[PDB]
């Protein structure tokens, strides 16, 4: 009852991070995208592309 | 309603005439006490002579004569309520006689018998009781002929005056054929409309209910409506919990999980060739889930690479780029590859293109309909 | 009197006949009495239905009642049964029930009969049931199996009916005189007859489906496969819908060979249609060959269905198919790649080296069949860099194109608009 | 109307790709998965 609901958090607050990150630019580097976030390549680059979806 | 031929029976035909599962032995036990319990002498020499089975003389003889003793016992209570009762007791000995021709297989004398029945009743529900049974006649049979003509008497009788519960089986029933005919779009439809007052269990469990509703509804729907109506709907949820592996298929697709999500398709796959209701589809199914997939993960790219593609999908390279070629040669997707450098540049149409090729299609269609319209009346 | 209730019956619709004979003959003399030099194709409208209708002892009786003007031409009928217009179409009815009767002897006299009263008869609003039969003059004498004299004589008529600006006479003897070329295969005069004759613009729209007919199979068996192709999908629509099956059973058949020889497949919907799966089966047969890509199944296809083949026409084509089959791989494989490798485009299409598939390829070019460009410096084919198809005059020429078709079509329906008094 | 006589004469909408002979989709992705 409470993981769910941080998960979902999490979730919510990467979405944000990512928004925020990106407003600035109009071509950037995945790899940059994720040193500003503070993730890893990988994960910023599926959550982005589920966020395009 | 009642199992009348319990549709289990064809299942377990079906899954017995297939190669790599014959005389397994399971299959033919559940069939064989199936058909004793049920004393379907007249099946049985039907399943009999299709697939040159050693036929039992000992036990068809017994089987024979009880449906013989039975059927006589019927008509013989039939002719008494003619001659003493009125029709009110008639139609229902009439009916019980049919029910029994069913059960025992006598396919032509059971319509014979339910066509009689349905002309001489007049009570609207008993109507639709008959129309039922013609369907699920036609459902257990695979006449398509049948079960559009009964599916066409139901809906009218419904529109003449019917009932909610009854409208439900009618849908169900139209969900099947319409998974039978594969028009998964609206077998869609009308297993998400009646998922949640699911009432027929003379078909199938609503575990197997469950299983096409999510199969159909992954086939025919988009992303927002699938998640909308099936990821997060209650009463779906509720049966995935007790189906670890449907839902791992569903939600392997959902979450864009794709190495699961070709796992699962191709154990779905081998369920829904055994299957038979979807038997005639599972080539059709397995290659529309791929071109979804594969639509998906393109849907937020620009240029993938096929070596990532392949990692994704759990795959070799030379593995999509064969699939891929053969979609994109077929028109399915919109994507070109790039061999040289291995690259999955994807072109897809702006919207201002889209609309001006639709434009182009919909005024070609239209205005080849008005010049033969003014060729038409100009003489 | 089981047979003689049936008679009865029989006589009953005879009757009812003879009443539309006598509207569409009323017809006829209100079109040449009154302007309008028309309404013969409202009485022609009907004629598949009295051909079909027509009886022995309706047109006995019919020709003992009739032709009571003058002249004894009844004896022509009378022996072979047991005004300006209404002659002709009554010798019309007469000639086309001998064609139903198969006696051909007789019914090629007597068109020949219709020939000469015509030929006599210098008429324009007769021009049409003129045209009606020189149709069935060419039908008699194909009968007959001599379609030689039908050259020169359809011909001459074909002279007679430009020379007098005709557009539905027109139309017919281009048709039946192309039929008649193809006949006998006369392929090149076909042609130059086509390069050097104007098909009336405003014709009748069957007249339209044949000549695009006999056009795209002129084009095909000359190499003009995109021009074949066009053609013949224009004939396919302005055919009728509920009949002419063997009219379009020919066109797709012929059609679907020529799109294979383009390098594309034919949609399957063809050979699922009720009417068409028998017919295009072999062909249904062809192009799963031809898009597997194997030459043993196409062998094998071929030698099982050549007798409907030397009953349809299409050997040199069917050849030809091989070629194309060929270039269908290649350009199969251009449609799904964008910078696919020779030694690639070879090895998915089992060519022999990648020195043949650049052959193959660059000739693929030439033709423009896949549009692409090519390099072998590094020897990869490299497709056209696609471009945003908006932007440019294309969509400009196609709404010009359908505008003035539109434009067209409303200044023919305000002028077709008509007052009669 | 017109008859050119003078030329003498699965519920479902099928697919081309439909009728392409190949193993099935689990074996295709076993043999992957067993070679990758």
């Given at each position: 009852?409470?993981?769910?609901?941080?998960?979902?958090?999490?979730?919510?607050?990467?979405?944000?991070?990512?928004?925020?990150?990106?407003?600035?630019?109009?071509?950037?580097?995945?790899?940059?995208?994720?040193?500003?976030?503070?993730?890893?390549?990988?994960?910023?680059?599926?959550?982005?592309?589920?966020?395009?979806? | 309603?009642?199992?009348?031929?319990?549709?289990?029976?064809?299942?377990?035909?079906?899954?017995?005439?297939?190669?790599?599962?014959?005389?397994?032995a399971?299959?033919r036990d559940?069939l064989m006490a199936?058909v004793r319990?049920?004393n379907m002498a007249?099946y049985y020499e039907?399943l009999c002579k299709?697939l040159d089975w050693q036929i039992d003389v000992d036990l068809l003889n017994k089987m024979k004569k009880?449906?013989?003793?039975?059927?006589?016992?019927?008509?013989?209570?039939?002719?008494?309520?003619?001659?003493?009762?009125?029709?009110?007791?008639?139609?229902?000995?009439?009916?019980?006689?049919?029910?029994?021709?069913?059960?025992?297989?006598?396919?032509?004398?059971?319509?014979?018998?339910?066509?009689?029945?349905?002309?001489?009743?007049?009570?609207?529900?008993?109507?639709?009781?008959?129309?039922?049974?013609?369907?699920?006649?036609?459902?257990?049979?695979?006449?398509?002929?049948?079960?559009?003509?009964?599916?066409?008497?139901?809906?009218?009788?419904?529109?003449?005056?019917?009932?909610?519960?009854?409208?439900?089986?009618?849908?169900?029933?139209?969900?099947?054929?319409?998974?039978?005919?594969?028009?998964?779009?609206?077998?869609?439809?009308?297993?998400?409309?009646?998922?949640?007052?699911?009432?027929?269990?003379?078909?199938?469990?609503?575990?197997?209910?469950?299983?096409?509703?999510?199969?159909?509804?992954?086939?025919?729907?988009?992303?927002?409506?699938?998640?909308?109506?099936?990821?997060?709907?209650?009463?779906?949820?509720?049966?995935?919990?007790?189906?670890?592996?449907?839902?791992?298929?569903?939600?392997?697709?959902?979450?864009?999980?794709?190495?699961?999500?070709?796992?699962?398709?191709?154990?779905?796959?081998?369920?829904?060739?055994?299957?038979?209701?979807?038997?005639?589809?599972?080539?059709?199914?397995?290659?529309?889930?791929?071109?979804?997939?594969?639509?998906?993960?393109?849907?937020?790219?620009?240029?993938?690479?096929?070596?990532?593609?392949?990692?994704?999908?759990?795959?070799?390279?030379?593995?999509?780029?064969?699939?891929?070629?053969?979609?994109?040669?077929?028109?399915?997707?919109?994507?070109?590859?790039?061999?040289?450098?291995?690259?999955?540049?994807?072109?897809?149409?702006?919207?201002?293109?889209?609309?001006?090729?639709?434009?182009?299609?919909?005024?070609?269609?239209?205005?080849?309909?008005?010049?033969?319209?003014?060729?038409?009346?100009?003489? | 009197?089981?047979?003689?209730?049936?008679?009865?019956?029989?006589?009953?619709?005879?009757?009812?006949?003879?009443?539309?004979?006598?509207?569409?003959?009323?017809?006829?003399?209100?079109?040449?009495?009154?302007?309008?030099?028309?309404?013969?194709?409202?009485?022609?409208?009907?004629?598949?239905?009295?051909?079909?209708?027509?009886?022995?002892?309706?047109?006995?009786?019919?020709?003992?009642?009739?032709?009571?003007?003058?002249?004894?031409?009844?004896?022509?009928?009378?022996?072979?049964?047991?005004?300006?217009?209404?002659?002709?179409?009554?010798?019309?009815?007469?000639?086309?029930?001998?064609?139903?009767?198969?006696?051909?002897?007789?019914?090629?006299?007597?068109?020949?009969?219709?020939?000469?009263?015509?030929?006599?008869?210098?008429?324009?609003?007769?021009?049409?049931?003129?045209?009606?039969?020189?149709?069935?003059?060419?039908?008699?004498?194909?009968?007959?199996?001599?379609?030689?004299?039908?050259?020169?004589?359809?011909?001459?008529?074909?002279?007679?009916?430009?020379?007098?600006?005709?557009?539905?006479?027109?139309?017919?003897?281009?048709?039946?005189?192309?039929?008649?070329?193809?006949?006998?295969?006369?392929?090149?005069?076909?042609?130059?007859?086509?390069?050097?004759?104007?098909?009336?613009?405003?014709?009748?729209?069957?007249?339209?489906?044949?000549?695009?007919?006999?056009?795209?199979?002129?084009?095909?068996?000359?190499?003009?496969?995109?021009?074949?192709?066009?053609?013949?999908?224009?004939?396919?629509?302005?055919?009728?819908?509920?009949?002419?099956?063997?009219?379009?059973?020919?066109?797709?058949?012929?059609?679907?060979?020529?799109?294979?020889?383009?390098?594309?497949?034919?949609?399957?919907?063809?050979?699922?249609?009720?009417?068409?799966?028998?017919?295009?089966?072999?062909?249904?047969?062809?192009?799963?060959?031809?898009?597997?890509?194997?030459?043993?199944?196409?062998?094998?296809?071929?030698?099982?269905?050549?007798?409907?083949?030397?009953?349809?026409?299409?050997?040199?084509?069917?050849?030809?198919?091989?070629?194309?089959?060929?270039?269908?791989?290649?350009?199969?494989?251009?449609?799904?790649?964008?910078?696919?490798?020779?030694?690639?485009?070879?090895?998915?299409?089992?060519?022999?080296?990648?020195?043949?598939?650049?052959?193959?390829?660059?000739?693929?070019?030439?033709?423009?069949?896949?549009?692409?460009?090519?390099?072998?410096?590094?020897?990869?084919?490299?497709?056209?860099?696609?471009?945003?198809?908006?932007?440019?005059?294309?969509?400009?020429?196609?709404?010009?194109?359908?505008?003035?078709?539109?434009?067209?079509?409303?200044?023919?329906?305000?002028?077709?608009?008509?007052?009669?008094? | 109307?017109?008859?050119?006589?003078?030329?003498?004469?699965?519920?479902?909408?099928?697919?081309?790709?439909?009728?392409?002979?190949?193993?099935?989709?689990?074996?295709?992705?076993?043999?992957?998965?067993?070679?990758?």
């Amino acid at each position: 009852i409470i993981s769910t609901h941080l998960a979902k958090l999490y979730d919510n607050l990467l979405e944000q991070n990512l928004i925020r990150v990106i407003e600035p630019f109009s071509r950037v580097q995945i790899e940059h995208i994720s040193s500003l976030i503070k993730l890893s390549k990988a994960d910023v680059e599926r959550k982005l592309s589920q966020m395009i979806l | 309603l009642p199992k009348n031929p319990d549709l289990r029976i064809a299942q377990l035909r079906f899954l017995l005439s297939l190669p790599e599962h014959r005389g397994d032995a399971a299959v033919r036990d559940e069939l064989m006490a199936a058909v004793r319990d049920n004393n379907m002498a007249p099946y049985y020499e039907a399943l009999c002579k299709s697939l040159d089975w050693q036929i039992d003389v000992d036990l068809l003889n017994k089987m024979k004569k009880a449906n013989e003793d039975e059927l006589k016992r019927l008509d013989e209570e039939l002719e008494d309520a003619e001659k003493n009762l009125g029709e009110s007791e008639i139609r229902d000995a009439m009916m019980a006689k049919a029910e029994y021709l069913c059960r025992i297989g006598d396919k032509e004398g059971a319509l014979t018998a339910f066509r009689k029945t349905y002309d001489k009743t007049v009570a609207l529900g008993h109507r639709l009781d008959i129309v039922f049974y013609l369907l699920r006649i036609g459902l257990f049979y695979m006449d398509n002929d049948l079960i559009t003509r009964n599916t066409e008497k139901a809906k009218s009788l419904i529109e003449e005056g019917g009932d909610w519960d009854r409208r439900n089986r009618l849908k169900v029933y139209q969900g099947l054929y319409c998974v039978a005919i594969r028009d998964f779009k609206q077998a869609a439809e009308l297993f998400l409309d009646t998922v949640s007052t699911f009432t027929s269990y003379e078909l199938m469990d609503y575990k197997t209910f469950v299983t096409y509703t999510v199969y159909v509804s992954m086939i025919a729907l988009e992303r927002p409506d699938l998640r909308e109506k099936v990821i997060k709907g209650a009463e779906i949820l509720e049966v995935l919990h007790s189906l670890p592996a449907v839902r791992q298929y569903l939600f392997s697709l959902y979450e864009c999980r794709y190495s699961v999500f070709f796992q699962s398709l191709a154990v779905v796959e081998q369920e829904m060739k055994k299957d038979w209701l979807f038997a005639p589809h599972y080539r059709y199914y397995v290659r529309e889930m791929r071109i979804h997939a594969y639509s998906q993960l393109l849907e937020s790219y620009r240029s993938l690479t096929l070596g990532y593609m392949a990692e994704a999908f759990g795959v070799g390279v030379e593995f999509i780029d064969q699939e891929l070629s053969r979609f994109i040669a077929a028109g399915r997707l919109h994507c070109k590859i790039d061999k040289v450098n291995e690259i999955v540049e994807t072109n897809r149409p702006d919207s201002k293109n889209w609309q001006y090729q639709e434009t182009i299609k919909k005024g070609d269609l239209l205005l080849n309909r008005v010049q033969k319209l003014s060729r038409v009346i100009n003489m | 009197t089981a047979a003689a209730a049936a008679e009865h019956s029989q006589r009953e619709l005879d009757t009812v006949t003879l009443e539309d004979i006598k509207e569409h003959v009323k017809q006829l003399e209100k079109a040449v009495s009154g302007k309008e030099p028309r309404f013969v194709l409202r009485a022609l409208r009907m004629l598949p239905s009295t051909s079909r209708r027509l009886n022995h002892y309706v047109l006995y009786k019919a020709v003992q009642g009739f032709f009571t003007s003058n002249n004894a031409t009844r004896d022509f009928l009378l022996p072979f049964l047991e005004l300006p217009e209404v002659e002709a179409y009554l010798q019309l009815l007469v000639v086309i029930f001998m064609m139903n009767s198969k006696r051909y002897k007789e019914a090629q006299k007597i068109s020949d009969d219709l020939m000469q009263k015509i030929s006599t008869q210098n008429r324009r609003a007769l021009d049409l049931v003129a045209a009606k039969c020189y149709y069935y003059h060419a039908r008699v004498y194909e009968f007959l199996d001599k379609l030689d004299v039908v050259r020169s004589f359809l011909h001459a008529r074909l002279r007679t009916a430009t020379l007098r600006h005709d557009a539905d006479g027109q139309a017919t003897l281009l048709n039946l005189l192309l039929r008649n070329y193809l006949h006998y295969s006369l392929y090149d005069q076909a042609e130059k007859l086509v390069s050097k004759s104007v098909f009336p613009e405003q014709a009748n729209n069957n007249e339209w489906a044949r000549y695009l007919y006999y056009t795209g199979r002129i084009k095909a068996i000359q190499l003009e496969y995109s021009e074949a192709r066009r053609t013949m999908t224009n004939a396919l629509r302005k055919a009728p819908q509920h009949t002419a099956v063997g009219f379009k059973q020919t066109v797709h058949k012929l059609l679907i060979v020529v799109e294979l020889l383009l390098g594309e497949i034919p949609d399957r919907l063809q050979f699922r249609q009720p009417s068409l799966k028998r017919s295009l089966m072999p062909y249904f047969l062809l192009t799963q060959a031809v898009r597997t890509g194997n030459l043993a199944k196409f062998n094998q296809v071929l030698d099982q269905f050549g007798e409907k083949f030397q009953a349809d026409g299409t050997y040199t084509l069917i050849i030809r198919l091989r070629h194309n089959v060929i270039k269908t791989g290649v350009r199969m494989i251009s449609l799904s790649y964008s910078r696919i490798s020779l030694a690639d485009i070879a090895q998915k299409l089992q060519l022999d080296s990648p020195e043949d598939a650049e052959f193959i390829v660059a000739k693929a070019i030439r033709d423009g069949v896949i549009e692409a460009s090519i390099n072998h410096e590094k020897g990869y084919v490299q497709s056209k860099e696609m471009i945003d198809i908006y932007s440019t005059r294309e969509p400009q020429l196609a709404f010009h194109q359908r505008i003035s078709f539109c434009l067209d079509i409303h200044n023919m329906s305000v002028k077709a608009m008509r007052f009669p008094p | 109307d017109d008859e050119f006589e003078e030329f003498p004469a699965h519920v479902w909408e099928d697919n081309w790709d439909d009728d392409n002979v190949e193993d099935d989709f689990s074996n295709q992705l076993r043999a992957e998965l067993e070679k990758h």
